Amino acid sequence: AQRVHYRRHNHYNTKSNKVRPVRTPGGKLTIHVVKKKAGKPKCADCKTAIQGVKALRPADNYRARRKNRTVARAYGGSICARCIRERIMRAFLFEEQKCVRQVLKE
Amino acid sequence: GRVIRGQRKGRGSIFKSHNHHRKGAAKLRHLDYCEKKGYIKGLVKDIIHDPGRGAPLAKVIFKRTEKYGKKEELIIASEGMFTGQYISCGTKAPLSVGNILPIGKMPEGTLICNLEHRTGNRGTLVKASGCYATVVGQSEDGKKTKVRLPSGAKKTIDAKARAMVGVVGAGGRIDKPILKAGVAHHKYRVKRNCWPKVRGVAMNPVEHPHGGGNHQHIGHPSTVSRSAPAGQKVGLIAARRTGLLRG
Amino acid sequence: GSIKRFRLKQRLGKCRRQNRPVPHWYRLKNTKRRHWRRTKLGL
Amino acid sequence: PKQITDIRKFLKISRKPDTTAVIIMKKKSKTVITKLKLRTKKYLYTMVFADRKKAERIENSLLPSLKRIYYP
Amino acid sequence: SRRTKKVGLTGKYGTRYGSSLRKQIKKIELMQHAKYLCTFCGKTATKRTCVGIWKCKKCKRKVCGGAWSLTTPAAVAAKSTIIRL
RNA sequence: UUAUCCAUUUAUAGGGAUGAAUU
RNA sequence: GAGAACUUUGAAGACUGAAGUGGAGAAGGGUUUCUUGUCAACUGUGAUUGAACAAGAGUUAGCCGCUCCUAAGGGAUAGCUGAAAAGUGUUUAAAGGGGUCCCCGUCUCAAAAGGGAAACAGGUUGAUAUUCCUGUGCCAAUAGUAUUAUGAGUUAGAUGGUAACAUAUAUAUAAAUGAACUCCUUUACAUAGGCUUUACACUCGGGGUGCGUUUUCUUUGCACUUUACCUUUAUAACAAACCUUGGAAUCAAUUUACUUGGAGAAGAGGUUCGUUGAACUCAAUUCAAAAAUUUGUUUUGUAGCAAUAGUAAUUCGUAAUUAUCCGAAGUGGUAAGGACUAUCCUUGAAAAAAGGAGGGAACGGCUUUGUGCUUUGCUACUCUUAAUACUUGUAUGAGCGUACCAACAACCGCAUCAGGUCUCCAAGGUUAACAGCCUCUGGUUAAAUAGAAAAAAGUAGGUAAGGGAAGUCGGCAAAAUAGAUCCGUAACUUCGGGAAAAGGAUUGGCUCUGAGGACAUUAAUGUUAACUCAGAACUGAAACGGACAAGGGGAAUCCGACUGUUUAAUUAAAACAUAGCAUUGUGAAAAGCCACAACUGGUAUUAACACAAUGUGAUUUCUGCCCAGUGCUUUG
RNA sequence: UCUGAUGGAGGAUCGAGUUGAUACUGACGUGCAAAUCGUUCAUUUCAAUCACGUUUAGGGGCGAAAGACUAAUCGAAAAG
């Protein structure tokens, strides 16, 4: 079996220094340490990641692509689908409830 | 001799509370004109666990009335409150589980938690998990009520003092037995340096008045006076009686 | 260490420069010598 | 680099004043064919071919005002 | 078949600790983790989530409750008296 | 209550009959 | 070389041997690094060697780190004490910023393993390299005018989809307006268990390139066969997210495991995020049929970087050329990702920084009246990306660290000391295995010495007839099977265990045999990947987990319940601790306990299911009498 | 109810490493070593181990408690 070698000056394996080796055109096994995958914006109601977005780290999100930042319903980074439809059918529900109450108050 | 463990406790070198992961102090809403003259409803967004204590806390979001915005408060949760409900604070707020009311508004015999032993302390008494006080009397002229605390003692508090109606959550926490030293270690690791104890009779006579001897015995009465100095208050402090109780 | 402060590196260079012997032409007319292994300069 | 076969864009890129390097391979498919590489400031744009006539068409479609160099 | 005749869940403790102590946590083990009933969905599937925090398997909305029960006998009585008014 | 002492805060509205709401 | 057991070269025999005297490692050291020369001393023997001595030389960064942020915390400010020294750090912050009047806000330091702008491959030196060269990129920054273009939207801002979903491929997918004031998200987080994907790792047979015994035989024993940063690669599958619709009972999709559902499932149709970043015709095409454009079938590619760079065998000025570089898979060793399940009286960190949103202060121009506003003519327009040319300071890119050792003589042990001192890597055989044992890349063949002889004695071991603890304070030391399969397993018990109880048989060998998955045909026949069992043989020196590797059991008594901890260098325990039990004090800032000289503070981000102070010490069963003595406590 | 049919809990077991130190009261004891070497033994999913940073200072600290440790110094460190 071949033998490995460290590069990144962070010579301790931490969740910012995870290693993968792959073969190179020079014919030797050099080092390739990945970036840390980032989380996704999530549901304020049922704790589910929002959709229409990707999970780039803040440095990359500073340059991210816009159409994979928000799915197509108004806000974008607000809420998931089955939990936004609840508010969707609740809005005019509450409005009508207050309206009928203020009408039949007499 | 030398300074004993009890005296060293007060120096606060390693005996400071291990509070790196605590989520914040559990304080009631600060007194306001709105809360003094009516209800204000804030919604509890999430019930979280504070590592130091057993009783879960609640993150109640109120909407500030003097400015646009919201203010988040950490409030000891009563047994039976859930995320998404509106909790009402003030004199005119209806009485219900979790609601915070002036003490002199609710009738006698009701169960309260997160007591305020002096008007404005935003929560001082009855805060441990599963604890509750009972309002056992109101003065005829108002401005004074009597409550019975979980210790079994009656205390007189002014009627303007606020409290939550209900019982502190996570009740009965002391019911299950800690099976092993490991659970006690994990319990006290997030609280203090009070564990393990180590008997004073197993120490040397230099470090403890109980220590010494060829037979591991106290040798002198273990009921010490209330006037005993710092290095003497080590046994049963000013004990009125000893032995098994008879009710 | 392979990583060091500027002042530490400058002092190391000064000690190395001070460890050289007396010029021969001057001797024609030193006791403060240290070996890196025997005596440490204590920095 | 991008394996591109559509010729409309290939004749479109003929007006870019930044492409200078032209490299010709000579590889035996089984027949002698070639892969024509041209310089692009962001990519190593090499075009793979399937017909010697098309390769000869392209290697004269190159705008000859600039440099020529081949690895072999 | 049925491997534990009486010990049940306490089999993870082996022979350690007292029999009466394991049997006293036998009063509580069958209910700390048990699937109890939620009041917003209707399935007997609630599970322990923390020391005081509780959750079923449908609602995704947590509830403050007892140490190892959704409700405590003190807290159901206290709520009943308040509701009666 | 004025000395004095204690508590709270952004010293932030005079007394009685699970969505928001700033210019 | 004057001089060679310990300098160099070649040959041989060997070792380190998958957890290395191997590469990179940090602390610590500081020139020990390299070249040349040299041997007065040192290199405990020699020494021409050297980490010694002498002269020169050597460390190149926008992308690797520090520098930035915040934690445990440190210092300081306001005060307040104190003779000061010093003690504490908002205890009556008037403390910088923001936008355009108001809002927020002690300062500073503390991480070369936490968070974090962006670099890869080949090559190069006597000594530096992801820093130097070549090539290819990436990130951050960039002030005032005139030209362009691209795309958008418009005479103040789009698209479909029953839905989920998705929506701009110019040089780059930029082109769907926007203030104060706010609300979120990323950063951003535990452990255990298995499942799965992918790269890498290893491996198998036959195609392209080299050596060999061959007395006795060979399709003979083997050996060398590549592709970074850069592209959402598209895909596709699979894991999850998500709609229509069926409208289930003789409930159903299903997972290794359970999960999910009438707030919607069989069943069907439909749609993203996450992966490897060539896998499926992906990129086309030869040709046909759909049709004012799609579907199928054949030729090109190591999907594009990509071979040409590197690499390898024979000829060949002594500089060259050659062609290969392929069908495939199989194991699961190491990493990461995904979706899950489970555990906590344990819930497993912050900011810097970045992004999204609610709302709407302000939005088409030229000139023209009066005082930013009503008004008269033409309506062409404005921005998102890239720049180009002149004025501002010159308009890219600071400073520091980069050599070497990292112990085997460069670190600490008074030393070139068998000691101590922070990750990854593992092929075969053997295996359960990163164990042990032999070897393969790499390294070494050196240790404060060498010959010869080989007695006593010492030390580290081996083997011993017959007896088998008679030795001895005491079975001290050593031996005894010990892996695996089949069988069998008591007293007692807290019912969980005891238990590998005890106790047996076998395992040697080869000739054998058989049985147990994925791919296709109108009940059967073809292509292609396992290691688990069983019985007949005979045979071999009647002996075999053949080396390595590995439990001695049983009957009882005493102590301690257990796991754990302890007298660093004479005592590891019956000692301590521990869950359990019990007692005591305390309702609070005029409390309990404790610190402080005072100020003040710890518990306390606490509140009797709490804190503090004790004693006893699983469980089971008990815990008797005595308040006279001494303590503690209570009334009058 | 049992039998048979399925998984992955435990301060569970063996066991290298790691952390230690039971015995030989072995060697050594003018040692490699002012505590080492050999064999043996204990420990390895948690009261676990390690590193760096940081806090606690001497009639003080810290101590699962040995009069232990606090730089070869401890029934009161070291320097003057």
mmCIF file with all atom_site columns, C-alpha atoms in Angstrom, chain B residues 143-209:
data_model
loop_
_atom_site.group_PDB
_atom_site.id
_atom_site.type_symbol
_atom_site.label_atom_id
_atom_site.label_alt_id
_atom_site.label_comp_id
_atom_site.label_asym_id
_atom_site.label_entity_id
_atom_site.label_seq_id
_atom_site.pdbx_PDB_ins_code
_atom_site.Cartn_x
_atom_site.Cartn_y
_atom_site.Cartn_z
_atom_site.occupancy
_atom_site.B_iso_or_equiv
_atom_site.pdbx_formal_charge
_atom_site.auth_seq_id
_atom_site.auth_comp_id
_atom_site.auth_asym_id
_atom_site.auth_atom_id
_atom_site.pdbx_PDB_model_num
ATOM 1  C CA . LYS B 1 143 ? -52.780 44.891 49.154 1.00 0.00 ? 143 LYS B CA 1
ATOM 2  C CA . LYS B 1 144 ? -51.781 41.746 51.102 1.00 0.00 ? 144 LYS B CA 1
ATOM 3  C CA . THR B 1 145 ? -52.139 38.001 50.523 1.00 0.00 ? 145 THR B CA 1
ATOM 4  C CA . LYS B 1 146 ? -50.882 34.820 52.168 1.00 0.00 ? 146 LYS B CA 1
ATOM 5  C CA . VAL B 1 147 ? -49.302 31.964 50.220 1.00 0.00 ? 147 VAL B CA 1
ATOM 6  C CA . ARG B 1 148 ? -48.005 28.547 51.228 1.00 0.00 ? 148 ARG B CA 1
ATOM 7  C CA . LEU B 1 149 ? -44.600 27.795 49.695 1.00 0.00 ? 149 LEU B CA 1
ATOM 8  C CA . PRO B 1 150 ? -43.351 24.321 48.706 1.00 0.00 ? 150 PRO B CA 1
ATOM 9  C CA . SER B 1 151 ? -41.296 24.232 51.919 1.00 0.00 ? 151 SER B CA 1
ATOM 10 C CA . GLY B 1 152 ? -44.556 24.240 53.888 1.00 0.00 ? 152 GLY B CA 1
ATOM 11 C CA . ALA B 1 153 ? -44.189 27.806 55.183 1.00 0.00 ? 153 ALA B CA 1
ATOM 12 C CA . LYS B 1 154 ? -46.729 30.621 54.974 1.00 0.00 ? 154 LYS B CA 1
ATOM 13 C CA . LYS B 1 155 ? -45.525 33.959 53.602 1.00 0.00 ? 155 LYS B CA 1
ATOM 14 C CA . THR B 1 156 ? -47.327 37.297 53.337 1.00 0.00 ? 156 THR B CA 1
ATOM 15 C CA . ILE B 1 157 ? -46.753 39.130 50.043 1.00 0.00 ? 157 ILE B CA 1
ATOM 16 C CA . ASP B 1 158 ? -48.347 42.311 48.740 1.00 0.00 ? 158 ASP B CA 1
ATOM 17 C CA . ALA B 1 159 ? -51.182 41.941 46.247 1.00 0.00 ? 159 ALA B CA 1
ATOM 18 C CA . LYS B 1 160 ? -49.305 43.691 43.423 1.00 0.00 ? 160 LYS B CA 1
ATOM 19 C CA . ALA B 1 161 ? -46.688 40.924 43.250 1.00 0.00 ? 161 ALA B CA 1
ATOM 20 C CA . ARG B 1 162 ? -46.860 38.871 40.062 1.00 0.00 ? 162 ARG B CA 1
ATOM 21 C CA . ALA B 1 163 ? -46.810 35.117 39.530 1.00 0.00 ? 163 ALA B CA 1
ATOM 22 C CA . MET B 1 164 ? -47.516 32.442 36.942 1.00 0.00 ? 164 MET B CA 1
ATOM 23 C CA . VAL B 1 165 ? -50.650 30.345 37.399 1.00 0.00 ? 165 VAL B CA 1
ATOM 24 C CA . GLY B 1 166 ? -49.722 26.675 37.235 1.00 0.00 ? 166 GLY B CA 1
ATOM 25 C CA . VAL B 1 167 ? -47.030 24.246 38.345 1.00 0.00 ? 167 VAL B CA 1
ATOM 26 C CA . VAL B 1 168 ? -43.384 24.272 37.269 1.00 0.00 ? 168 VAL B CA 1
ATOM 27 C CA . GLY B 1 169 ? -42.723 21.734 34.537 1.00 0.00 ? 169 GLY B CA 1
ATOM 28 C CA . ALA B 1 170 ? -40.586 18.597 34.666 1.00 0.00 ? 170 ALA B CA 1
ATOM 29 C CA . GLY B 1 171 ? -42.365 17.587 37.851 1.00 0.00 ? 171 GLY B CA 1
ATOM 30 C CA . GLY B 1 172 ? -41.261 14.638 39.930 1.00 0.00 ? 172 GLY B CA 1
ATOM 31 C CA . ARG B 1 173 ? -37.656 14.804 38.705 1.00 0.00 ? 173 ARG B CA 1
ATOM 32 C CA . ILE B 1 174 ? -36.350 13.356 41.994 1.00 0.00 ? 174 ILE B CA 1
ATOM 33 C CA . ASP B 1 175 ? -38.576 10.273 41.692 1.00 0.00 ? 175 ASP B CA 1
ATOM 34 C CA . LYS B 1 176 ? -36.288 8.131  39.548 1.00 0.00 ? 176 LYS B CA 1
ATOM 35 C CA . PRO B 1 177 ? -33.157 6.849  41.313 1.00 0.00 ? 177 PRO B CA 1
ATOM 36 C CA . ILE B 1 178 ? -29.780 7.902  39.981 1.00 0.00 ? 178 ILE B CA 1
ATOM 37 C CA . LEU B 1 179 ? -28.562 4.397  39.180 1.00 0.00 ? 179 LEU B CA 1
ATOM 38 C CA . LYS B 1 180 ? -24.815 4.997  39.205 1.00 0.00 ? 180 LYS B CA 1
ATOM 39 C CA . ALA B 1 181 ? -22.026 7.446  39.980 1.00 0.00 ? 181 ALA B CA 1
ATOM 40 C CA . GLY B 1 182 ? -21.967 8.358  36.294 1.00 0.00 ? 182 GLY B CA 1
ATOM 41 C CA . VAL B 1 183 ? -25.355 10.061 36.284 1.00 0.00 ? 183 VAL B CA 1
ATOM 42 C CA . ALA B 1 184 ? -24.452 12.029 39.418 1.00 0.00 ? 184 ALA B CA 1
ATOM 43 C CA . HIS B 1 185 ? -21.153 13.029 37.797 1.00 0.00 ? 185 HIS B CA 1
ATOM 44 C CA . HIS B 1 186 ? -22.934 14.235 34.665 1.00 0.00 ? 186 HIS B CA 1
ATOM 45 C CA . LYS B 1 187 ? -25.568 16.017 36.765 1.00 0.00 ? 187 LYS B CA 1
ATOM 46 C CA . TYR B 1 188 ? -23.104 17.983 38.893 1.00 0.00 ? 188 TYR B CA 1
ATOM 47 C CA . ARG B 1 189 ? -20.663 18.595 36.017 1.00 0.00 ? 189 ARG B CA 1
ATOM 48 C CA . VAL B 1 190 ? -23.049 21.227 34.633 1.00 0.00 ? 190 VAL B CA 1
ATOM 49 C CA . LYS B 1 191 ? -23.870 22.662 38.075 1.00 0.00 ? 191 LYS B CA 1
ATOM 50 C CA . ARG B 1 192 ? -20.986 22.915 40.546 1.00 0.00 ? 192 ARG B CA 1
ATOM 51 C CA . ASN B 1 193 ? -18.032 21.266 42.315 1.00 0.00 ? 193 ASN B CA 1
ATOM 52 C CA . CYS B 1 194 ? -20.056 19.833 45.203 1.00 0.00 ? 194 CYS B CA 1
ATOM 53 C CA . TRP B 1 195 ? -19.413 16.196 44.254 1.00 0.00 ? 195 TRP B CA 1
ATOM 54 C CA . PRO B 1 196 ? -18.008 13.800 45.380 1.00 0.00 ? 196 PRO B CA 1
ATOM 55 C CA . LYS B 1 197 ? -18.495 14.657 49.069 1.00 0.00 ? 197 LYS B CA 1
ATOM 56 C CA . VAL B 1 198 ? -15.810 12.735 51.019 1.00 0.00 ? 198 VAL B CA 1
ATOM 57 C CA . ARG B 1 199 ? -16.625 12.297 54.700 1.00 0.00 ? 199 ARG B CA 1
ATOM 58 C CA . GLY B 1 200 ? -14.966 14.666 57.131 1.00 0.00 ? 200 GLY B CA 1
ATOM 59 C CA . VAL B 1 201 ? -14.419 11.725 59.475 1.00 0.00 ? 201 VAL B CA 1
ATOM 60 C CA . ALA B 1 202 ? -12.247 10.099 56.787 1.00 0.00 ? 202 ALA B CA 1
ATOM 61 C CA . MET B 1 203 ? -9.986  13.161 56.540 1.00 0.00 ? 203 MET B CA 1
ATOM 62 C CA . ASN B 1 204 ? -6.981  14.035 58.669 1.00 0.00 ? 204 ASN B CA 1
ATOM 63 C CA . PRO B 1 205 ? -7.502  16.146 61.813 1.00 0.00 ? 205 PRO B CA 1
ATOM 64 C CA . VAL B 1 206 ? -5.761  19.091 60.126 1.00 0.00 ? 206 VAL B CA 1
ATOM 65 C CA . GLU B 1 207 ? -8.379  19.464 57.377 1.00 0.00 ? 207 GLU B CA 1
ATOM 66 C CA . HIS B 1 208 ? -11.521 18.687 59.380 1.00 0.00 ? 208 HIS B CA 1
ATOM 67 C CA . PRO B 1 209 ? -12.634 18.641 63.040 1.00 0.00 ? 209 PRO B CA 1
#
